[PDB]
Amino acid sequence: DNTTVFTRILDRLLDGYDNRLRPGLGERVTEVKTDIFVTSFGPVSDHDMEYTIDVFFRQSWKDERLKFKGPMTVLRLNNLMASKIWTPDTFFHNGKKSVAHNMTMPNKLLRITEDGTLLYTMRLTVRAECPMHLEDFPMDAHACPLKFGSYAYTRAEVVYEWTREPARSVVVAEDGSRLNQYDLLGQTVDSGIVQSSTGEYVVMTTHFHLKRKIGYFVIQTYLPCIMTVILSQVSFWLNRESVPARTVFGVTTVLTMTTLSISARNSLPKVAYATAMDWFIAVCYAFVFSALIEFATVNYFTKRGYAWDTFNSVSKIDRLSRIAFPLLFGIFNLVYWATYLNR
């Protein structure tokens, strides 16, 4: 009676239990109550269009074949009782590769109350698809979804609901946010009905709204482009005669523009359209190429081969370009930074 009291109870519940059958098969849906405690929103891979999430996926349903009367109201059992009873086969619709953690013992728990209410919490690391639209890259915001539902049981057999209020059913941990470049604004849940070839299922949708931070692309791509187009714009301030001094201002700036375009394109998946960074790079490339062809136009108009401390003179094209180029680039910068920063 010291230990066999609970043993006899656990033998009484598991006797006559067909684990292949859902509770209330030909009588009622098996109401399943679900909530997610997100411990750590992991890193988001832009290249693979996927994100990683670490959860404490909780489920709760009502099996009346597990009722008991005894000295303890709630039986907290280990993982071995979970394999010997019915469990819902919930799978993630947009999941790519999710690993249930087994160190040191399968991260599961099972709590059976005396009225038949169960609670089956699993710890999962889910890699899910996040379809991205990188048209306003990098000043873009995504809504990464997480769709889960039953695989074998239709709408008439198993339905899903949130065990708390839907605003407070997906809880994100405070210190746990492994996001590097994005920023988690907030969660958003949804419950719909999907229709497939095998039948009609119940799907639960959770959207995570992410906003990309701008500091890395400003400090790595935008500001080097601004500095090199400023560097190509000081070409007009030198002497008209110094052709070998001013040809490197064309050549090296064009080479840095091309390799900056390559380095900026090599940090994002190979999409078929052009981002806002591509438009900024193209306009800056047009400016540095315009500087080079203006110098070529000056060199065509440059007579003689000496310098006056003698009528080589400063070019009027040069004098107009010194005012025309940085003002036009500032106008483009104002238009570009006012168009995309308020969307």
């Epitope: 209410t117 339905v159 839907p166 419950s191």
Partner: antibody
Framework: VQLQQSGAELVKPGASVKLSCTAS????????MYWVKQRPEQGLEWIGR????????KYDPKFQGKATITTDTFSNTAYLQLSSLTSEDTAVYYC???????????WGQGTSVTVS | NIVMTQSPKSMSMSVGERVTLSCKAS??????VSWYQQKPEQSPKLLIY???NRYTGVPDRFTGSGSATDFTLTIGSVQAEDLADYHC????????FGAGTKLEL
């Protein structure tokens, strides 16, 4: 699936009244229970929520202190208490059951409270 | 909290034509909006749940239509027993309701 309550009550202002909501055909502890207030010729407003399995209750931010909700599984009846009753507190009080997709499927017959 | 604006307030038709009742919210309450009717001296009865999911015992004329914020109940070919006070309420958070719409002849 049948919800029953008390009758109509009239009290002086500043008094206290306890009203009840009993149920049949189901156990209360599986689902939530909702209390709402229906003012005459007006809209509906939600008073509070009670979870009978956990004993967890919470209320509208306009209705703390003067409205508390208690549950009793053994009598199969959910209780609501009103304190510091005012002249504007006259309404009809409905008792609601949480149902499918949070819809308030079954509603009580309503108890009309009045002042004098 | 979450406010539920119900429009229009009071308008009356004849018998046998379509009508639409609009419901709006301050933030996202997506497919968690319940519609009820209020006969005089009667308890409220659930018409549709979710966004567009017909309850048992509800005729085919009542049809909802849902979105993130905007919701619409459509009653096509109304009758003389369909007059009530129609209430729109959300349940994405702690629940709220609207003012109610009146149907007369």
């Amino acid at each position: 699936v049948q919800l029953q309550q008390s009758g109509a009550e009239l009290v002086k202002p500043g008094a206290s009244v306890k009203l009840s909501c009993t149920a049949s055909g189901f156990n209360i502890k599986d689902t939530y229970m909702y209390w709402v207030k229906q003012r005459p010729e007006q809209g509906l407003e939600w008073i509070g929520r009670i979870d009978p399995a956990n004993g967890d209750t919470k209320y509208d931010p306009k209705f703390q202190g003067k409205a508390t909700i208690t549950t009793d599984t053994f009598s199969n009846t959910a209780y609501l208490q009103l304190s510091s009753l005012t002249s504007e507190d006259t309404a009809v009080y409905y008792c609601a059951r949480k149902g499918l997709r949070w819809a308030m499927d079954y509603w009580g017959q309503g108890t009309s409270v009045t002042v004098s | 909290n979450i406010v539920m604006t119900q429009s229009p307030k009071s308008m009356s038709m004849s018998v046998g034509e379509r009508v639409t009742l609009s419901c709006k919210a301050s933030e996202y309450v997506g497919t968690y909006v319940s519609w009820y009717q209020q006969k005089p001296e009667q308890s409220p009865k659930l018409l549709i749940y979710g966004a567009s999911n017909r309850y048992t015992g509800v005729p085919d004329r009542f049809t909802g239509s849902g979105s993130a914020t905007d919701f619409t109940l459509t009653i096509g070919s109304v009758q003389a027993e369909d007059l009530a006070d129609y209430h729109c309420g959300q349940s994405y958070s702690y629940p709220t309701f609207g003012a109610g719409t009146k149907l007369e002849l």
